Design a protein around this nucleic acid. Sequence first.
DNA 1: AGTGTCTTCTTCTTTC
DNA 2: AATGTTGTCTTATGCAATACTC
DNA 3: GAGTATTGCATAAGACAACAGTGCACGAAAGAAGAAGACACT
DNA 4: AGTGTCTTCTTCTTTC
DNA 5: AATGTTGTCTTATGCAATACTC
DNA 6: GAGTATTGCATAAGACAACAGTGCACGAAAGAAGAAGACACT
Lengths: 269, 269, 214, 213, 49, 49, 49, 49
Amino acid sequence: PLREAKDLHTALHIGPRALSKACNISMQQAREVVQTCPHCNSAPALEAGVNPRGLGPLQIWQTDFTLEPRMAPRSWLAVTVDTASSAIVVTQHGRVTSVAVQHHWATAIAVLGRPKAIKTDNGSCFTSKSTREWLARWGIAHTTGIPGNSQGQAMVERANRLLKDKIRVLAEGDGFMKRIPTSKQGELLAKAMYALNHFERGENTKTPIQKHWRPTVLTEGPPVKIRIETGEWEKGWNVLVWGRGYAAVKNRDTDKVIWVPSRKVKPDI
Amino acid sequence: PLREAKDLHTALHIGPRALSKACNISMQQAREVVQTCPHCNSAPALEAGVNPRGLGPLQIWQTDFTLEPRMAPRSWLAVTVDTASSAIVVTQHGRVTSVAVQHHWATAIAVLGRPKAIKTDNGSCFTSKSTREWLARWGIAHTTGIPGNSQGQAMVERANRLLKDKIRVLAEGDGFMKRIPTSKQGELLAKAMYALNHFERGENTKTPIQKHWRPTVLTEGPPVKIRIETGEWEKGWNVLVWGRGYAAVKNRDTDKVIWVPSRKVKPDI
Amino acid sequence: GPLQIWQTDFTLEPRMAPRSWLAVTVDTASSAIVVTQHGRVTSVAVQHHWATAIAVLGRPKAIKTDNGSCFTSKSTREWLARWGIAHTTGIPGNSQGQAMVERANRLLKDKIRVLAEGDGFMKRIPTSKQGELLAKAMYALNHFERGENTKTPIQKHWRPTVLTEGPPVKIRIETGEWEKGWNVLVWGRGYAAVKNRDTDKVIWVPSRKVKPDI
Amino acid sequence: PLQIWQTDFTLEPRMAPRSWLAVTVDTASSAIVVTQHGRVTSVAVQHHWATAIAVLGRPKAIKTDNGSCFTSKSTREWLARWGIAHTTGIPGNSQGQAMVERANRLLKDKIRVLAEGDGFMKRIPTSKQGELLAKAMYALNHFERGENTKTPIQKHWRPTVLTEGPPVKIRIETGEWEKGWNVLVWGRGYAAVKNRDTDKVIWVPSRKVKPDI
Amino acid sequence: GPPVKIRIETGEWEKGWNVLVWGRGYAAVKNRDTDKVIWVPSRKVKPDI
Amino acid sequence: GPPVKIRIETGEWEKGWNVLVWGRGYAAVKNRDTDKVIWVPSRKVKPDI
Amino acid sequence: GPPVKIRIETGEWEKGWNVLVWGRGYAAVKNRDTDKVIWVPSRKVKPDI
Amino acid sequence: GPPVKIRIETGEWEKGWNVLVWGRGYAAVKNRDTDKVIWVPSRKVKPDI
DNA sequence: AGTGTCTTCTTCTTTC
DNA sequence: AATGTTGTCTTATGCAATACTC
DNA sequence: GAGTATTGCATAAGACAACAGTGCACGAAAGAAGAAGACACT
DNA sequence: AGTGTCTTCTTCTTTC
DNA sequence: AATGTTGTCTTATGCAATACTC
DNA sequence: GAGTATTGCATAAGACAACAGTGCACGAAAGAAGAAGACACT
Ligand SMILES: [Zn+2]
Ligand SMILES: [Zn+2]
């Protein structure tokens, strides 16, 4: 019966099927009666998101710093990535100060073209005064991420692991278990850069040295259904790119291209 | 073009697809040829180990200690389980010492009968000769787990979490979000005791107390094949208990009983 | 079932160390006993003993209430009403109260004095072996026979048995019809071993292809 | 491209102690790369060559000079390890090698002008030289030299923009494979394709479509 | 607005405050008393009750 | 903004609700006249009208 | 004995060990030339070469 | 244990190899006269008898 | 009465 | 003011290549 | 003479793991090692 | 005599 | 000597049972 | 009247965290606020 169950729960909170048992109560009634004690239940939460990217190259550069223990005299490595055609460039330094960053942003521009956004974290070196005037002199935009958050710069964070693994396996090739001699601490990063740039990565089709010079840009996409807040999938959108876990959909009549998770997309017809 | 590829990997350690595309060699040949540097040859096996357990209702016990901050100054809790029909017994002392677990087990025995074997941690209070002679005089076999692994006692390291959650709910379901007054814990622990094992826990269709008192044991089982380390599934075995994993297999030729993961089991015929 | 009526009692002899003024409770149907220490005769230190007894035995229905000391407070009355158990509150001694607990009290006194004498300490026992001594008496009196019967209280209250055959099962899958009913066995993944009720033959019917009859 | 790479050493005092500089230029869509090394050493030569390779590509038939620290058997072995044709041509030698000296004066005037622009008449401080040298790279390699309409980087890399995928073989409901279709966005399961001439769009299961020749 | 159980740096969930403005995978949360707006990734909030 | 269509005991299809804060497991009930703090499961509910 | 590599609590893979006898989830491990024969859980051994 | 055959660099099936307790993925095998133990991947080895 | 073991009183070790 | 990610391994499945067979 | 009949391939899913300025610290119970002082045989 | 900004120093704070 | 686990959630199907549709 | 849409419930079939004695500590670069010796006024 629908009696004594309320006080049984509010005194000895237990499972729904157990409460239904010994009281001949249906599963639905048990559920609706247990979903009243705010101390119990109310589990689900949390959502997700993606990092905006750039369709064309030279738009969304990212940069960061690291520390290599076996780089004895000056570890303090700096790395930059393109986030459109995945190419990387590294630089060596001995002390993290806001002259090293300015020096580092002088070989990257020489090697690649000229970017338009250098979004990074909010470390003390970047958010200085001498750096803002230097940046404004060239004329590049600048933005930062949420303080404390680490997943914003996911691309460079992931590339760091690959860089470290490659450098380690190359170091222990001729035999060097400790800090590399300073004489040979030179023409060793060049080999790593060459290997990581002018060759295929994983199982992809083209090197990110031609994927940068001659990229591919589409002009229209097949009809596609996209999930909305409600269960309904809206149609009338056009996809632009579709990777492992992201999509770059665009409206048919307003041109408001936005990036969404790759789960909320299905083909049409 | 193979001769070049022999030295290309030694020089660079690029990858099989890249080698195939840059030397016009088949993928099978490239994969075969790239095995010379263990640095690039991770070869992970990592083995697998799982599920030690007993069968008889009153033959294996486990016990351990926990610290509860919300609890009164006597903030040390001893908890024990019987890993045939899961039943929980808990007491509160407040000072981890040798004389603590010689009254703890004395209280525990008086509601469950005399067990036949105990396997616990290799800590301090379980190693004194004062406790060793007490165990010998009472007449119970004793053993210990490996020095350092916390997974050897999973059957209680999982139960204590549920106990803590239940006690926290019962505590802050009545306007007590802090140290409980010293005039309520004795009455509250009894209600926790009653609520833990007198009704179905989860989805199994049997109360733990009745499972302990009137268990079920069968003789002989259906045919079944087990994939022993010799690649393929042998014969001459019968399954006599099988739950959410941790299958147990009895010999069919002469005699033996073993515990194996539930992966090496197929219901023959 | 052997759960019809319980009895409670408050006992002197503070020869047993401080935390004296013991509290005892015995069932009539199966003759099982539980005793606990106390600090003083207080209403609040009654529910503690009652909850301990409930957690160790079960939920009673009728309890022979001792009359006079503290079992009249509104707090205790509402506490009892919360769980909904029937208290008697009759005339103690003659037919209620001290109607069955005499032998239990005598036996527990004999046991405690014998265990005390067996290990020394002629005088008041040191206040460090209280529970470890009480548990031995508990275990002896509730597991090692009371009189001259083969009806020890644990066995006569829980009725221990051993089972070999599981619940019945129906195989209404062939063309919408089932047999008289067979026996389920080990419920491994994918299938469900089933044995015949009479011919006793094992079949690995699919798990989707069996139902719980009646 | 990457045929007749030319590299050479030149002294310069208006700098760090650093009494030497190594320059390298390709004799096709001339691009300039210069290091900032000190005293002349074969190890430094190897370092310069490695940096040039990493920044441009893998060349062949490289000629620099004869004599000096270039006949080292260690350097010979290092070169042969990668495997590159080497030429012992005379440094300068007029002929079709003189663009090194042609660009040396351009680099010198550019660097002196840009140095004197921001003060420092006599000598630049030590912690001001990396970016100063880096800016010259960009200023010389991202703009027309003095008469062309195409930058050296353009003439070297042939930039372009694409909008269509490769030809892809399509299976139709006869067992055989149809010809003359292009792939598009590789969706989940489906492999949407477009016609070459009739401009259709159609989603097709992956197993019903294969790469073309 | 509807409050959350916003997570803290070490780890916990407490009835902190509610949310003022939303958008993509980031949100602005208020404070009950001191009233300081804080940006926070969406994967850290949790609805109440 | 757009209201919802929900069950409690018999049917309360009426307006006065929102989808401005939408979740997969809940919907953050909030009335345009008095607001709410309870939230509702999203599976058992549907769009209004 | 086949050379295997082990896993100490500071996430670092040590070499120079050989196995002596295995069981059903535990193994006996001995050092190369500094024998301190001990037991080890199964999920801490990686084959080498 | 029983004789086994493995694939050496000049691929063929040959004898003189005993397999101990096996292991998924990589295995170990011993000699008869030299008593020399090696690790070999799974698909490269086949039971002799 | 040197020492010599018994008594006692320190100073390290392991495991959680 | 401002959002995870890819290189390596693993296992699942349809079609040719030598019996096959009645 | 067509089923069939397995087996060796050529490939699609499908997880897995680490990347983040750097690592240690203390408290407590029981036991063991060793060493200094003290009363008896020497 | 009282002040009192200028300059220099002396702390404290915030991110990684 | 001496070996992971289980109460909570969601998402993935079938078929009886209404609701219809020319 | 047979082929069809909708539901609803009923499974069932996977995934999913958290448990371990207690938690912090330190270095470095850049900026910011406040305060003291000091030569105006005074
Ligand atoms: Zn509740
Ligand atoms: Zn390699």
